[PDB]
């Protein structure tokens, strides 16, 4: 019915008017490319040949467009159509008369997409504004879209079969809009959290931590090769940090050339000892933490997720705030190129040798588990004798579960800490966790020491059978193993019952993901529809479509969210 | 023992039998995170291999068969009953877990191009097209014949030379996109000759005809099935996954010279990023690489039953130490480009990798001024129909947040469904307009002078007309 057509989603009101299928759009799998800049995207040749951007013939560009017309559709840098002044369209594929090929001012030649054509790149779902960014086009000879790895974090895209949509603006006006509003370098900092959206990620982060250690010393030729990939190099080789006996540069010395202009920033490495700041060696840090950059030169410090990541006050954030968006784009690209070419010399890996720990550490983990199981047994015996006293506001069952969970969690965390102590400097799990590229201390602990308690619906594994978790356990068994505690690590391997309980926990995680996608989508759509028309007028009042004043000044101070920074008042706290 | 239960009434035959068919192919399942086993169960259904030994006789749509399937070097005991050895899906690959050039970052994979040249992960794609000569129509007969442009009033300019006399292309003939696989003609009633009814190859198939069969179907009409074969060499978009839930595309392909090499000369067929392992906690992958190295040297297929208690990482490491390698499986690698030893020692070992059905050639689509829908006069939908990608409501909200009003206007009006209507000035209702006659008149007012041209999306015109059919009057007044 008419109401049925209009009412539902995919109806005329919403499926055909608010959104609709569009021309000049392309889609294919995305794959990585460290060599492309932040703003560049690698387009396949077939996609580039199908998509055409009409160019008006001017006296300036008549020769170039004439050559493109002569090439035709078959040769790649060719023209698919000629649009005359009258509006007549001459498809060049089917034979055009040699008279038709002649061009005069006012004709519109539809050239194939070429290098440097601005496009809009999208990945569904388009949760935020950074999910559609304007990219320059670089044609490369394979059939996948190729984007830089730093740009993956705004899109929330990884290269495991993901896909993205390419929209080509068809007019100079909309092309200029994209160029000056939505290009990737212009949207490095989000107004949502006044932090940079994009940061150094994956291999480059892990390798920048290693590159910036005090230990790293580079010889002459390696410095030559690293400087070769630095796009903004002045052509002057820095004086080596160690002139004699053999000239040897340092990783910080080369990274200082990457840092844009003169940027001043102080950040702390992840492994920074808390006591260091108060005690001596505060400025001469024993562990080479406390990153300090003075005059755009890395005086000291080990770079990590905090310094080069997506957080307020990061080196990239200070670069965008101080130097500008263009120099910051160069900064991202140069970090990636130089550090990735050093990683060929150094290299990274993950093996079983990382998961395995010392025998003493394994014995300590086993002893912690033994005494934890004994403590849970003692709590159970107290509950059976009714000696346990209920916690206020909780039933005796609830307080018994609380105490048992406290004991098991303390044992779990203690075993994890012992495993983390066992890790050597060379351990690669620790490399990735310390750099912040991937993983967490929890993952190391589960890999090496103890997987932990499996909880479903916020409680230990429930009694699915009559008064017992699995048929193998005895009725009314509240002990650690029965209710889901996984004593073995992933390396050691889960026992069959622990395997099933772990499967139950993982299933709960999967279900939560599936549910959260839909519920969050609905919430986001409702918010957008409620506030779509609100905007800052030229009075600088924030008004809706009806012109009712929502706010007299935007944010009550009339400032935009990206420019602001965290600061301390310093008059508030001190005593009189 | 220390008394726990003295009244056992039954015993499990083997705990590994709790797993199903797809989870039984996972080696060392108990050493992986649970979501990863769940993901591998889904990925294993999409792997490529010989699906059935009678595949030559079968004419199925979308059949993929790998050139050189191999049985796993590290296999579960329960795989024997699944017949996985008889019909394997995947190839044991020397896999190095390393960061080489940054093209293996995220979940992508660097593959050896020389290995790909030697047959590594090469597959065939068979697609079958069926057509039926239907004489059921009263005066319509869908005869199989080769259409002729002069004889048939309805025709298309695609290549018709391939068709033989019967209207069916012979086996062994290369077919490129937009070629006529089967030629069929419907005799046209002469109300007062031929509307073309040929079937055309899916774009970019680029295959060679394998088999052409002519039979009579259940209805007794002549039935023709044509199978087109396309070899599929792995590319830099194809999706490859291991048995431990690690899926990823091919980032780039380096030749054997460029790939890092051990001192023995072994270059990894596949390089995977070390960053995939820690967050996902798929230690079963690492133990499978270690056991695969030990198995390849020893010559016995390794045992990876879930719950064994006789196979430990330490035992595998000692076994590998006997065969002259580092006990943990690390190997000293040399950089292919410069020849210098890589300072970190890279973990290299054989690992069963699979090739999933998702390939970039099937998933690449581009649209530019294509056909439009009938009802909405908007671009079609789907790769088969050359459909444009949808600019959803979330996309338009992003563009509003940008402040790109003109790009939004182009994408939502000019690129999709531009249209022009004539609207009376006195009454907002649309008015009849004869451009060729140059006479524009509005019914209901008896007014000709006051008419204005309005540019609106065709979908909006359809919306207003559907409102009018419900007796709502959307009077759009320019004033």
């Amino acid at each position: 019915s008419l109401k049925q057509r209009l009412k539902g989603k995919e109806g005329r009101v919403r499926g055909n008017l608010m959104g609709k299928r569009v021309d000049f759009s392309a889609r294919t799998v995305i794959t990585p490319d460290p060599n492309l800049s932040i703003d560049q995207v690698g387009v396949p040749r077939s996609i580039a040949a199908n998509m055409t951007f009409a160019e008006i013939v001017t006296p300036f560009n008549i020769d170039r467009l004439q050559e493109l017309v002569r090439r035709g559709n078959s040769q790649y840098p060719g023209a698919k159509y000629i649009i005359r002044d009258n509006g007549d369209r001459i498809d060049l594929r089917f034979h055009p008369k040699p008279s038709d090929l002649h061009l005069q001012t006012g004709y519109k030649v539809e050239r194939h997409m070429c290098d440097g054509d601005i496009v809009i790149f999208n990945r569904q779902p388009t949760l935020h504004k950074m999910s559609m960014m304007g990219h320059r086009v670089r044609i490369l000879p394979w059939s996948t879209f190729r984007l830089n790895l730093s740009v993956t974090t705004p899109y929330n895209a990884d290269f495991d079969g993901d896909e993205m949509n390419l929209h080509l603006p068809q007019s100079l006006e909309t092309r200029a809009e994209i160029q000056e509003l939505a290009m990737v370098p212009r949207m490095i900092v989000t107004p949502q959290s006044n932090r940079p959206v994009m940061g150094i990620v994956q291999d480059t982060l892990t390798a920048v931590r290693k590159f910036t250690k005090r230990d790293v010393f580079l010889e002459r030729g390696e410095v030559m090769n690293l400087l070769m990939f630095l796009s903004t190099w002045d052509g002057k080789v820095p004086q080596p940090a160690i002139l004699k006996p053999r000239p040897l540069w340092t990783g910080k010395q080369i990274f200082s050339l990457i840092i844009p202009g003169h940027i001043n920033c102080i950040r702390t490495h992840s492994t920074h000892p808390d006591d260091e700041d108060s005690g001596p060696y505060k400025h001469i840090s024993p562990g080479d933490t406390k990153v300090v950059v003075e005059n755009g030169e890395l005086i000291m410090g080990i770079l990590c997720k905090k310094s080069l990541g997506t957080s307020a006050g990061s080196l990239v954030h200070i670069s965008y705030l101080e130097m500008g968006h263009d120099i910051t784009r160069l900064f991202y690209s140069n970090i990636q190129t130089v550090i990735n070419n050093w990683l060929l010399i150094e290299g990274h890996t993950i093996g079983i040798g990382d998961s395995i720990a010392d025998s003493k550490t394994y014995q300590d983990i086993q002893n912690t588990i033994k005494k934890a199981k004994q403590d849970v047994i003692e709590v159970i015996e107290k509950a059976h004798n009714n000696e346990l006293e209920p916690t206020p506001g909780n039933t005796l069952r609830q307080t018994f579960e609380n105490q048992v969970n406290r004991i098991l969690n303390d044992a779990r965390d203690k075993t994890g800490s012992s495993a983390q102590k066992s890790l050597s400097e060379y351990n690669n799990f620790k490399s990735m966790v310390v750099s912040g590229a991937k993983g967490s201390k929890i993952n190391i602990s589960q890999v090496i020491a103890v997987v932990g308690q499996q909880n479903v619906e916020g409680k230990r594994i429930p009694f699915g059978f009559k008064h017992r978790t699995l048929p193998h356990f005895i009725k009314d068994d509240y002990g650690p193993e029965s209710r889901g505690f996984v004593e073995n690590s992933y390396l050691a391997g889960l026992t069959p019952t622990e395997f099933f309980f772990h499967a139950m926990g993982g299933r709960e995680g999967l279900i939560d993901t599936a549910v959260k996608t839909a519920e969050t989508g609905y919430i986001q759509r409702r918010l957008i529809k409620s506030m779509e028309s609100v905007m800052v007028k030229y009075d600088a009042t924030v008004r809706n479509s009806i012109n009712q004043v929502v706010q007299l000044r935007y944010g009550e101070d009339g400032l935009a969210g990206e420019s602001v920074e965290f600061q301390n008042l310093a008059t508030l706290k001190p005593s009189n | 023992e220390v008394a726990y239960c003295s009244t056992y009434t039954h015993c499990e035959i083997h705990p590994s039998m709790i797993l199903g068919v797809c989870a039984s192919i996972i080696p060392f399942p108990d050493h992986n995170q649970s979501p990863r086993n769940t993901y591998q169960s889904a990925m294993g259904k999409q792997a490529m291999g010989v699906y059935i030994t009678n595949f030559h006789v079968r004419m199925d749509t979308l059949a993929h068969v790998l050139y050189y399937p191999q049985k796993p070097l590290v296999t579960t005991r329960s795989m024997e009953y699944l017949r996985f050895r008889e019909l394997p899906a995947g190839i044991n690959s020397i896999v190095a877990i390393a960061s080489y050039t940054g093209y293996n970052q995220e979940d992508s994979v660097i593959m050896n191009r020389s290995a790909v040249d030697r047959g590594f992960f090469r597959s065939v794609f068979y697609r079958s097209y069926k057509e039926q000569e239907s004489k059921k129509g009263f005066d319509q007969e869908e005869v199989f014949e080769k259409p002729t442009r002069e004889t048939c009033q309805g025709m298309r300019h695609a290549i018709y030379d391939k068709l033989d006399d019967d209207g069916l292309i012979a086996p062994g003939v290369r077919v490129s996109g937009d070629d006529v696989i089967i030629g069929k003609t419907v005799t046209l009633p002469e109300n007062e000759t031929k509307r073309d009814c040929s079937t055309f190859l899916r774009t970019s198939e680029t295959g060679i005809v394998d088999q052409v069969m002519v039979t009579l179907n259940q209805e007794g009409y002549k039935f023709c099935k044509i199978r087109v074969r396309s070899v599929r060499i792995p590319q830099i978009g194809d999706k490859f996954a291991s048995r431990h839930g690690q899926k990823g595309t091919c980032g780039i392909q380096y030749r054997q010279e460029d790939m890092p090499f051990t001192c023995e000369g072994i270059t990894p067929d596949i390089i995977i990023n070390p960053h995939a392992i820690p967050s996902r906690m798929t230690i079963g992958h690492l133990i499978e690489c270690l056991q695969g190295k030990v198995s390849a040297n020893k010559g016995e297929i390794g045992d990876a039953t879930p719950f064994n208690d006789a196979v430990n990482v330490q035992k595998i490491s000692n076994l590998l130490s006997d065969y002259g390698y580092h006990l943990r499986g690390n190997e000293v690698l040399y950089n292919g480009f410069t020849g210098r030893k890589i300072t970190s020692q890279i973990f290299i070992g054989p690992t069963y990798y699979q090739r999933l059905k998702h390939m970039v050639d099937d998933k690449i689509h581009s649209r530019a001024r294509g056909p439009i829908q009938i009802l909405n006069r908007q671009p079609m939908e789907g790769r088969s129909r050359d459909g444009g990608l949808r600019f959803g409501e979330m996309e338009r909200d992003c563009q509003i947040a940008h402040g790109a009003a003109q790009f939004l206007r182009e994408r939502l009006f000019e690129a999709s469904d531009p249209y022009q209507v004539h609207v009376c000035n006195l009454c907002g209702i649309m008015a009849i307009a004869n451009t060729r006659t140059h006479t524009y008149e509005c019914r209901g007012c008896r007014n000709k002078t006051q008419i204005s041209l309005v540019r609106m999306p065709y979908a909006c015109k359809l919306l207003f007309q559907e409102l009018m059919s419900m007796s709502i009057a959307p009077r759009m007044m320019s004033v």
């Binding site: 969970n405 098991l408 779990r412 929890i442 589960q446 932990g452 909880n455 409680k459 709960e508 | -």
Partner: peptide, 8 residues
């Protein structure tokens, strides 16, 4: 899969 306070 860790604990009651963590993740499943």
């Amino acid at each position: 899969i860790w604990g009651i306070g963590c993740n499943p």
